[PDB]
Amino acid sequence: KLLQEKNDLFLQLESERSGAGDVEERLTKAISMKNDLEGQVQELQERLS
Amino acid sequence: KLLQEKNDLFLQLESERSGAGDVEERLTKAISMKNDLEGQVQELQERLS
Amino acid sequence: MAEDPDPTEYLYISMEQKRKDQTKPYDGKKMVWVADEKEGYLLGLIKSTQGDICTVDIEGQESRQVKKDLLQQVNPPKYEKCEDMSNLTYLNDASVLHNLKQRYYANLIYTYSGLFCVAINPYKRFPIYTNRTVQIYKGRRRTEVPPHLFAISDGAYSAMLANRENQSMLITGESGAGKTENTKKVIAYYANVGAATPKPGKEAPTKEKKATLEDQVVQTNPVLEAFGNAKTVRNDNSSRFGKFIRIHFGPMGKLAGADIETYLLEKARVISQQTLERSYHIFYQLMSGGIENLKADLLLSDDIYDYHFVSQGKIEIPGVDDAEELRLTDTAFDILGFSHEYKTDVYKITASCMHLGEMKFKQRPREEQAEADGTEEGERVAHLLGVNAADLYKNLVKPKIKVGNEMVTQGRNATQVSYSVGGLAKAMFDRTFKWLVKRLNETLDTKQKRQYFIGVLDIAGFEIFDYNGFEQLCINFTNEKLQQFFNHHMFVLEQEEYKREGIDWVFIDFGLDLAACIELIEKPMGILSILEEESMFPKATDKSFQDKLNANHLGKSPNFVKPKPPKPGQQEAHFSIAHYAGTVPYNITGWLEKNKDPVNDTVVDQFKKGSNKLVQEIFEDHPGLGAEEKGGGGKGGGGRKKGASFQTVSALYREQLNRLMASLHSTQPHFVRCIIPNELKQPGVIDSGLVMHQLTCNGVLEGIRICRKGFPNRMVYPDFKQRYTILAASAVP
Amino acid sequence: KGFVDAKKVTEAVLGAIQLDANDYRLGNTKVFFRAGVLGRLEEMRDDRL
């Protein structure tokens, strides 16, 4: 039973790490997307000039 | 050792859970500035044309 | 005995101080402290005051006209060479300066300023860590326990075991302020008092009488110091890594285990050291101590000066050998529980890194695809790994180049190969010491006791030189935060603890803060800086890095010292941060490759398919070390953490920063503020120019102004009420 | 025990297994193998093997 609290706290932890696993991919995908949107912006302004 | 590892995990469960929230704030940075950038792509493309 | 209590011998200061009348007719009442060059601050007398101007002479009698607000009021010798600093009254600068200079020089290094002591690193092996010192001190009644580090650790052990809250022990210092040597004495209290050490034989000199956990936890520190320590221009014994010791305590009193983390390692110095620095200690030991047999199987030269990754030459360490020190440490493996194979196996994986840089690439201009002129140099590496020779010497120059996801062979050009070979050395050493510290911890993990602790923030650095790179910056990046935790713990968390304990205390502060420069929370630290958000793109440089710091901090952030022009046009790129102990010059050109780490894939993948057990373990995922190329999806690593590229270590040093700091502010701190007396590495020499910067800058004047009334002894109310009770048989019944 | 010129060390090992230095040709870094020679070496081990 003491170990079952250790079991659940560890199952949980792993699911927040795996939620953050999602968030790893999600985050870096959003960062890479920013840099393309930058390249969409900066130049399109420059083509106005 | 198990009566302690109960509280041990709980402490680390604060550790990874704030780490989820803060990195999600840095993901909120993306989720927010995305709209502005799309707005900028709208106002850019429409005027160069 | 005259406000002070009763003395002991050299361990204490001269604490049966006199009250010699001569000092007294000077308290009348217009003497002051004045700026001199020679001592620092000195004694002056107000003779005549011209309103806001003052004519004050000096000990030298030179009559000088001064402007009011400099005149620091005289604070007389009632407080000369006491054990604790506390009692000193007029805490303006001179009053503290004088008093510490002549403490160090009067043999007392470690001086009390409440709990957080001041220590001016002696640089000597002082015979005060004797078991005399550590036999009397078996949970002693602290007057016989005077200003040495055993009491500090006694007072930690004596609060903690009772009051059940987790603890820290944090020594700060600058370059070669003997950090490690100090922590060995924290541990040398613990290893000879509170544990099961059978003491009734009374030997003051060499004890060596159990417990075995004590004899083991000690030996892991020489083992750590042979491998991870090397030398610098300032520092002979330069721990080229930064560790954290979690000293564990069980249910009943005595030791339970010890968890050492490790932060960085200086793998970059392995190709060539700069100026008078020495290579990683373990190496030289293995060279000189090895015998005729071992010498063959390991592939040592008989002659010296061959060993091509030892630059400048063979430099010595003052007053130690290399050769007998081998035989000490090898048996400190035996004593830990290593096996007769694994002995040879750790040295096998260590010496190849001394070898490798022997591989002489040479220009054959028909193409420039150089291959290296020999085999011996490569074989003395190859055997000790027991990797496929037919792979190494082909596939290093001709690897299976992954094009996107398909595969085309390429021959590599001369310098890429030399560089990748130097890369192969820095790959081997980094991975192994990280393998080693865990495989050390495994023997000393709290084997069915309890993980209750003291965390020791033993990060070895803050070491100032002309060359400071990224390497220096990521070490210096904690040490900074440590001085920030000083502010956060000398004002703040000291008394925040008094507050939690609901004591008779008054919250008072002064105002010292780094947080208007340096980033403390893991995400501020994982926003710092133009390195994780941009290391993946081909056009970013250490030049745009400097320019984006110069955009994103300068003018408006007053703490960032800018370069003295190595930036207009032609940069090496330098900048500085206002870190307490010293404005330090950094260089930026290079960092990118130290935050990408580029080797050869095909060979380290084929090394994964290696032999010799330990040599093998050092390679893969499953725990998470190498498996080092191919493509984890596009994150930046790694494995944990992040995806693929080889490394990215600055983000992994986010991952452990969160978990460490979270603990640190929860676990109540003990501190020791170690300072250095001279530049020249010398024993006993103190310098006043240095000391005048340093005692201003370590938070010392301010850090007596509160911590004077701050408490250095701390234990528990139930025991102390119950151990006393009937002393008042008149008053309490 | 006596490793020195690796060229000279290798002539000795290959001289004990009796191959003149013209079936395997030497250069500086590398050894060239004529037909059979490498896969005769493999065979020689793999006789006892």
Report on the architecture of this protein:
This is part of a larger assembly, with four copies of chain A. Chain A has one helix spanning 2-48. Chain A is an all-alpha fold and 49 residues long. Chain A starts with a helix and ends with a helix. Chain A is 96% helix and 0% strand. Chains in contact: A-B, A-C, B-C, C-D. It is classed as contractile protein. Keywords: myosin interacting-heads motif, cryo-EM, thick filament, flexible docking, single particle reconstruction, iterative helical real space reconstruction (ihrsr), inter- and intramolecular interactions, myosin regulation, super-relaxation, striated muscle, tarantula, contractile protein. Two heavy meromyosin interacting-heads motifs flexible docked into tarantula thick filament 3D-MAP allows in depth study of intra- and intermolecular interactions. Chains A, B, C, D: myosin 2 heavy chain striated muscle. Organism of A, B, C, D: Aphonopelma.
Give the key terms.
part of a larger assembly, 4 chains, 49 residues, mainly alpha, 1 helix, 96% helix, rod-shaped, contractile protein, myosin interacting-heads motif, cryo-EM, thick filament, flexible docking
Task: Estimate the global geometry of chain A from the Cα principal axes.
Answer: rod-shaped
Spatial extent as radius of gyration of chain A? 21 Å
Pair with the biggest interface: A-B, 27 and 28 residues
The beta-strand count of chain A equals 0
- H/E series of chain A: H
Main sheet overview of chain A: none
What oligomeric state is this?
Answer: part of a larger assembly
Distance between the termini of chain A: 71 Å
Structural class of chain A: mainly alpha
**Beta content of chain A:** under 5%
The number of helices of chain A is 1
Q: What is the helix fraction of residues of chain A, given as a range? A: over 70%
